[PDB]
Amino acid sequence: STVESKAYRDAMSHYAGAVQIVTTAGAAGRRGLTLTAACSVSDNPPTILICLQKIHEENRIFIENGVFAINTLAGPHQQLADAFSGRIGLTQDERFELAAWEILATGAPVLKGALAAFDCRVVSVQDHSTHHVLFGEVVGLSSHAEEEALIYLNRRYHKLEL
Amino acid sequence: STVESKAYRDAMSHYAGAVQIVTTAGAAGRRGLTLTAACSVSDNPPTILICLQKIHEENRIFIENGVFAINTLAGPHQQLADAFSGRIGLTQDERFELAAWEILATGAPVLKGALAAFDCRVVSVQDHSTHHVLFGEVVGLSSHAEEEALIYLNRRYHKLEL
Numbered sequence: 036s037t038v039e040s041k042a043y044r045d046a047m048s049h050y051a052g053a054v055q056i057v058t059t060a061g062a063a064g065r066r067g068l069t070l071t072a073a074c075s076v077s078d079n080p081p082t083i084l085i086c087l088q089k090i091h092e093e094n095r096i097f098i099e100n101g102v103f104a105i106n107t108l109a110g111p112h113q114q115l116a117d118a119f120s121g122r123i124g125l126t127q128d129e130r131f132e133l134a135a136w137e138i139l140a141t142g143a144p145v146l147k148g149a150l151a152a153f154d155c156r157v158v159s160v161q162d163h164s165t166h167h168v169l170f171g172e173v174v175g176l177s178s179h180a181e182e183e184a185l186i187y188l189n190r191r192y193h194k195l196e197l
Numbered sequence: 198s199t200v201e202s203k204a205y206r207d208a209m210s211h212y213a214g215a216v217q218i219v220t221t222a223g224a225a226g227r228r229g230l231t232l233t234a235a236c237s238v239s240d241n242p243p244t245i246l247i248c249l250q251k252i253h254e255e256n257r258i259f260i261e262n263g264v265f266a267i268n269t270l271a272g273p274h275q276q277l278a279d280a281f282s283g284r285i286g287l288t289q290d291e292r293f294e295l296a297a298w299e300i301l302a303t304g305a306p307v308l309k310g311a312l313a314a315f316d317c318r319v320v321s322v323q324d325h326s327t328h329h330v331l332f333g334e335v336v337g338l339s340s341h342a343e344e345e346a347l348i349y350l351n352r353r354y355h356k357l358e359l
């Protein structure tokens with residue numbers, strides 16, 4: 036037998052993570068959300084994975100379009116993160132209005148003034164209890180030189196110098 | 198076509214990660230190493246994944262034993278991390294001598310004075326180009342109240358307050 040759900044979450048509050056915004060576009064429509072469960076798989080050919088909650092049915096739009104982009108956040112941007120987690124109201128079109136964006140290879144929206152960004156095509160989809168897991172290969176890039184990074188730890192937000 | 202290997206690594210130097218030590222034991226022997234590519238998959242039942250380099254053949258000992266543990270590091274511990282990345286010499290028995298350890302459910306070594314720890318049984322193994330990916334379910338736990346965490350960013354080490 037496995038350990039209890041509540042006790043697992045209390046221990047994970049001592050494990051730190053860098054804050055992302057992930058996006059999509061195509062015949063099923065345009066969507067974004069705030070996220071921490073992602074990691075690097077290989078550098079030859081370059082490959083990345085992400086994990087999405089099954090209890091929100093609008094997350095099936097990512098699987099139907101077959102493309103996604105991942106954007107890494109800098110020091111001054113706590114207001115953008117609160118909006119894309121659903122804490123303060125608003126329609127999707129009203130959430131995107133808060134900043135400036137550009138296009139690279141696939142159609143998915145890329146953020147101006149990000150620390151880094153990766154534009155991807157889907158190669159595999161798997162089912163794991165409470166979440167779906169998606170694998171993608173990298174077809175476009177950008178990066179800029181800013182002075183601090185945004186981090187989540189012990190149930191609150193922080194800033195850290197490069 | 199995909200982007201170039203060297204350009205991918207320069208952009209990933211702007212993406213932060215918390216520092217772990219991962220361990221194993223059984224009929225194929227006892228081993229450890231320093232690591233950043235891991236993440237949380239589900240909370241019902243609790244489940245975690247890890248990624249291991251194919252170019253070092255001693256990493257096949259983890260697959261043969263069928264068990265592993267993951268340990269999260271605190272502020273004062275940069276010397277332990279340098280030893281388990283292979284930067285300063287020593288045999289495996291000589292690396293474990295530098296600190297104190299205990300036993301929970303499987304046999305794999307758990308660290309005294311860690312910020313958090315998770316003891317796991319293997320349920321799935323997959324092949325992805327340069328690395329192997331392993332999935333595990335959680336059968337034991339511990340945690341302690343320390344004041345800072347260890348982080349890797351922009352090709353050097355840092356400290357961050359809880």
Ligand SMILES: Cc1cc2nc3c(=O)[nH]c(=O)nc-3n(C[C@H](O)[C@H](O)[C@H](O)COP(=O)(O)OP(=O)(O)OC[C@H]3O[C@@H](n4cnc5c(N)ncnc54)[C@H](O)[C@@H]3O)c2cc1C
Binds near residue numbers: 068069120
């Ligand atoms: C630090 C952190 C890390 C996270 N990591 C992950 C992760 O790894 N994986 C994951 O899956 N989730 C993660 N989440 C959670 C995720 O951000 C939310 O579940 C998600 O944003 C909720 O989607 P929603 O707002 O559209 O859903 P809902 O709140 O149910 O709303 C659905 C839709 O209704 C519309 N709507 C809502 N309010 C209004 C309004 N007042 N007026 C008009 N229209 C409205 C909007 O279009 C909205 O999208 C994380 C959250 C945080 C804070």
Ligand SMILES: Cc1cc2nc3c(=O)[nH]c(=O)nc-3n(C[C@H](O)[C@H](O)[C@H](O)COP(=O)(O)OP(=O)(O)OC[C@H]3O[C@@H](n4cnc5c(N)ncnc54)[C@H](O)[C@@H]3O)c2cc1C
Binds near residue numbers: 075352
């Ligand atoms: C010695 C070393 C090894 C590392 N290995 C990994 C790793 O396996 N996975 C990971 O997510 N982070 C890894 N990192 C952390 C981080 O992602 C890197 O700092 C950065 O991406 C690569 O630049 P570098 O010059 O520090 O690595 P280098 O010194 O140029 O490379 C060391 C070795 O690790 C591999 N490697 C380095 N970065 C990655 C990566 N992002 N994804 C897959 N393989 C990589 C390379 O193929 C090489 O064999 C490693 C860091 C160091 C110092």
Ligand SMILES: Cc1cc2nc3c(=O)[nH]c(=O)nc-3n(C[C@H](O)[C@H](O)[C@H](O)COP(=O)(O)OP(=O)(O)OC[C@H]3O[C@@H](n4cnc5c(N)ncnc54)[C@H](O)[C@@H]3O)c2cc1C
Binds near residue numbers: 231233234349
């Ligand atoms: C920040 C960071 C993140 C990383 N993330 C990852 C990751 O996600 N995934 C991953 O796979 N790797 C990662 N790495 C790299 C990983 O730590 C090393 O590849 C690994 O520790 C090397 O194994 P090794 O020392 O046993 O290999 P080797 O240097 O080739 O040595 C093999 C063995 O020989 C013996 N030996 C060596 N020297 C002596 C001596 N002088 N006297 C007697 N015996 C000796 C030891 O038993 C040693 O284990 C990361 C590294 C860093 C710095």
Ligand SMILES: Cc1cc2nc3c(=O)[nH]c(=O)nc-3n(C[C@H](O)[C@H](O)[C@H](O)COP(=O)(O)OP(=O)(O)OC[C@H]3O[C@@H](n4cnc5c(N)ncnc54)[C@H](O)[C@@H]3O)c2cc1C
Binds near residue numbers: 190
């Ligand atoms: C609203 C919110 C959602 C988050 N969702 C995720 C997530 O999906 N994946 C992730 O790795 N980190 C997630 N985190 C970040 C972090 O891992 C948590 O802060 C901590 O583990 C759980 O405690 P909590 O009280 O903040 O979450 P809660 O407010 O109690 O939970 C919010 C929701 O997210 C789910 N969830 C929370 N933590 C995890 C977890 N570690 N693994 C899987 N599901 C989780 C829960 O089932 C719940 O539906 C989330 C954080 C917030 C604030």
